[PDB]
Design a protein around this ligand. Structure first.
Ligand SMILES: Cc1cc2c(cc1C)N1[C@@]3(C(=O)NC(=O)N[C@H]3N2C[C@H](O)[C@H](O)[C@H](O)COP(=O)(O)OP(=O)(O)OC[C@H]2O[C@@H](n3cnc4c(N)ncnc43)[C@H](O)[C@@H]2O)[C@H](c2ccccc2)C[C@]1(C)N
Lengths: 133, 666
């Protein structure tokens, strides 16, 4: 029903190796050259990646900023209101970005701001200009 | 098996079923009610048991009926029919046994038997036992034929058949009880030694053997399941198939490597894209940090836009730093995934040069068993007689196999040094024209009712013929002769003054340097009481080694043994013999094999007797006149002694049925 274990024989393969006098040597050479081809292609990309790794030397260590740990506040200082309006102008609806810019307002408070000061800060106009970019 | 059922087994008969032959002789019983069949079967089985329990004395019908019980001993004609059938076809009272009823005073019919090998001798005894006039014509100065035994002083070594291939169902088991045969078991273990003269480690010795067995199973699969049996009109050989299978195993090895390194490039190319993304991100981070820095240099107090810039750029920087950290996370995953794949590569090669040489020994051993290059064996049929193999350990005949034919030859009319030249057969009878081998001009004529030809297939193949048939053998017979294979294997007998090898090791191998010479002195036998080593020449080597002198052959033998046991532990041999079976004009080979293009059916064709045309036109269909026996005539046991023996018994029964009439078929 099936070939022995560790033995590989398919109808398709048999016909291909018995096609002529040296169809056996031909098929085995095409794969011999295919192997050499892929093997030198490996060392090529290995060399490419080695050079790319050296350009990433040091990581992003001299460019990291210390952690700002500030507690979330409920009241909106005029300052924070103005930060918000500008954050809307730059980020649109990314409430996570806006929350991070202000620093002491939670993502939900940011969404509340959008409804509370809607008319007073023409947030409709501010948002439609963000989309214009 | 044991009892009456074991007797059927020991006679190669199914204990609970009637054979085709039995159906022919007892068509009343087999076509009858089941109960009668079982009575028949028991009678048959019990009679066999009786003969088998004591094969040194003749078993008469009287002695048989005596020891039969009710209700089996009630029908005395049924018992007489069974006994007669068994005696006629040589299942009982065959070989060498003391006769209770001394041979009939006068003889009926006359048979000439060509050749006094085991097949010839077996038939001769039977025919004489049936009361026929029998003369055997042997070309050699001895009996036995391909049972040849070298004897000198205390040294005894068989140049021909040597091994009893298991007693379980072997007719030679009966013979071995009748003749003083010193049978000694063969220990299976066979340590191999490479060209350098050093043993193959149990590691490789098992890896290669298992691969050999796997390669065989694979060819069987190719034959039966993929139906790879005809290539370019030519029938596929075992050799061709093995080559193809090997090539596909080397292909798979390369296929595995290709897709493994193909896994590596795909991962390495993912890394390439990730590293590019990382370099471009570290670039934007570098610039963005500078922008945040410059925004912070603007010292307070500052308006809200200037404050926003600082905050905005702070956010953007930590956002891009979040990405890079998640990309360096992925970099570590792929980077270890590459060390994963590079750590465990697939197989480097299918078989190394060292491996392929050891595999070639296994091929040589198979070429030895079939006495022929694997490229000659039929893929489909080479092993057609596997199902009929005997059970039990293979044994050697320690006192020389010749003791068997010699014992069979006793009391028979044998013309030695008598080379048959022509066989003439006609509706009225036969004449056989032979000459004396010493002075070829001295001619003999033998007139007989029937001729039994036991000429080896090698002889029958000769072109131009060594034996002429008048009229010529029919096309169906000669085509069978051409199609069938007749192979060759040779022996080198080495007689020393002392045992320098392992006494507990029966056989050890030598691994040849090349495929071409894999058969050359590849195996050695230690079997005899005396210090005798026996070297085998198989495959393509056998035919070539015959054109090389004994001194050079023995030279190469010593070289090999020196390499294995020590250059000073191997003395000069006192006596040496080298066989040349292909050269031998009375053999022209060693024994038959199922050639590519042939089948087991050709063996049946060989066994078919020849019936001459009528003398006077319009005269009734003649009796068959020319009968055939021998190794190459028995489909289920070809190339053996027991096969030859059995074919002899077969023909003797057929001839006696023809010329003495079957009284048991009523
Ligand atoms: C050679 C050889 C053969 C055997 C082994 C080794 C070698 C070296 N070995 C085996 C063994 O152990 N055990 C066996 O059972 N058989 C072994 N075999 C095969 C058996 O030996 C073989 O099958 C069997 O013995 C053959 O019996 P016939 O059919 O009777 O043929 P024959 O030629 O004997 O009688 C014909 C006579 O006619 C005369 N004549 C000729 N012309 C004329 C003429 N013009 N006018 C007048 N006369 C003429 C000739 O001179 C000759 O006398 C083995 C074996 C091997 C593989 C598978 C199974 C068994 C093993 C072994 C060692 N390898």
């Amino acid at each position: 029903r099936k070939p022995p274990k560790g033995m590989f024989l398919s109808q398709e393969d048999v016909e291909a190796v018995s096609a002529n006098a040296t169809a056996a040597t031909t098929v085995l050479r095409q794969l011999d050259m295919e192997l050499v081809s892929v093997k030198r292609q490996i060392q090529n990309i290995k060399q490419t990646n080695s050079a790319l790794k050296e350009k990433l030397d040091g990581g992003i260590e001299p460019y990291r900023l210390p952690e700002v740990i500030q507690k979330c506040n409920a009241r909106w200082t005029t300052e924070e209101q103005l930060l918000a309006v500008q954050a809307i102008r730059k980020y649109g609806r990314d409430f996570q970005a806006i929350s991070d810019v202000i620093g002491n307002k939670s993502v939900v408070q940011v969404k509340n701001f959008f409804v509370n000061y809607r008319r007073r800060f023409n947030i409709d106009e501010v948002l439609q200009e963000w989309e214009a970019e | 098996p044991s009892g009456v059922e074991g007797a059927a087994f020991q006679s190669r008969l199914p204990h609970d079923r009637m054979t085709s032959q039995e159906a022919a002789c007892f068509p009343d019983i087999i076509s009858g009610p089941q109960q009668t069949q079982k009575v028949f079967l028991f009678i048959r089985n019990r009679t066999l048991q009786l003969w088998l329990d004591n094969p040194k004395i003749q078993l008469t019908f009287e002695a048989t009926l005596q020891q039969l019980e009710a209700p089996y001993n009630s029908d005395t004609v049924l018992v007489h029919r069974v006994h007669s059938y068994l005696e006629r076809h040589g299942l009982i009272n065959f070989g060498i046994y003391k006769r209770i009823k001394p041979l009939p005073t006068k003889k009926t019919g006359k048979v000439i038997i060509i050749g006094s090998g085991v097949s010839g001798l077996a038939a001769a005894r039977q025919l004489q036992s049936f009361g026929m006039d029998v003369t055997l014509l042997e070309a050699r100065d001895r009996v036995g034929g391909r049972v040849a035994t070298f004897r000198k002083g205390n040294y005894v070594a068989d140049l021909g058949a040597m091994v009893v291939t298991g007693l379980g169902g072997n007719p030679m088991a009966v013979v071995s009880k009748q003749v003083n045969m010193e049978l000694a078991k063969i220990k299976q273990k066979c340590p191999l030694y490479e060209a350098n003269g050093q043993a193959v480690p149990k590691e490789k010795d098992e890896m290669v053997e298992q691969e050999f067995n796997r390669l065989l199973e694979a060819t069987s699969y190719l034959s039966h399941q993929l139906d790879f049996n005809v290539l370019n009109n030519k029938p596929v050989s075992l050799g061709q198939a093995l080559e193809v299978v090997i090539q596909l195993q080397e292909k798979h090895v390369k296929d595995e490597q290709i897709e493994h390194w193909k896994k590596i490039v795909k991962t390495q190319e993912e890394l390439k894209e990730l590293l590019n993304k990382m370099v471009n991100l570290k670039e934007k981070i570098k610039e963005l940090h500078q922008q945040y820095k410059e925004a912070s240099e603007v010292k307070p107090p500052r308006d809200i836009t200037a404050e926003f810039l600082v905050k905005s750029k702070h956010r953007d920087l930590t956002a891009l730093c979040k990405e890079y950290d998640e990309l360096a996370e992925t970099q570590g995953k792929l980077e270890e995934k590459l060390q994963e794949l590079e750590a465990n590569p697939p197989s480097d090669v299918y078989l190394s040069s060292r491996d392929r040489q050891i595999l070639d020994w296994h091929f040589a051993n198979l070429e030895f068993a079939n006495a022929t290059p694997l490229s000659t064996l039929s893929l489909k049929h080479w092993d057609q007689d596997d199902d009929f193999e005997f059970t039990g350990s293979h044994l050697t005949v320690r006192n020389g196999y010749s003791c068997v034919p010699v014992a069979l030859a006793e009391g028979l009319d044998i013309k030695l040094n008598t080379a048959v030249r022509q066989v003439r057969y006609t509706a009225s009878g036969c004449e056989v024209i032979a000459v004396n081998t010493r002075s070829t001009s001295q001619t003999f004529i033998y007139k007989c009712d029937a001729v039994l030809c036991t000429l080896p297939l090698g002889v029958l193949k000769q072109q131009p013929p060594a034996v002429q048939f008048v009229p010529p053998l029919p096309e169906w017979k000669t085509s069978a002769v051409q199609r069938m294979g007749f192979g060759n294997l040779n022996k080198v007998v080495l007689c020393f003054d002392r045992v320098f090898w392992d006494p507990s090791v029966n056989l050890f191998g030598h691994v040849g340097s090349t495929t071409a010479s894999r058969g050359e002195l590849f195996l050695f036998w230690n079997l005899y009481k005396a210090p005798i080593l026996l070297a085998l020449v198989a495959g393509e080597a056998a035919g070539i080694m015959e054109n090389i002198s004994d001194d050079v052959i023995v030279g190469r033998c010593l070289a090999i043994l020196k390499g294995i046991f020590g250059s000073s532990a191997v003395p000069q041999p006192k006596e040496t013999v080298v066989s040349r079976w292909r050269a031998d004009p009375w053999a022209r080979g060693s024994y038959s094999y199922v050639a590519a293009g042939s089948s087991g059916n050709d063996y049946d064709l060989m066994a078919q007797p020849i019936t001459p045309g009528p003398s006077i036109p319009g005269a009734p269909q003649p009796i068959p006149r020319l009968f055939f026996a021998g190794e190459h005539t028995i489909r289920n046991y070809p190339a053996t002694v027991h096969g030859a023996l059995l074919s002899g018994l077969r023909e003797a029964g057929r001839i006696a049925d023809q010329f003495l009439g079957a009284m048991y078929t009523l």
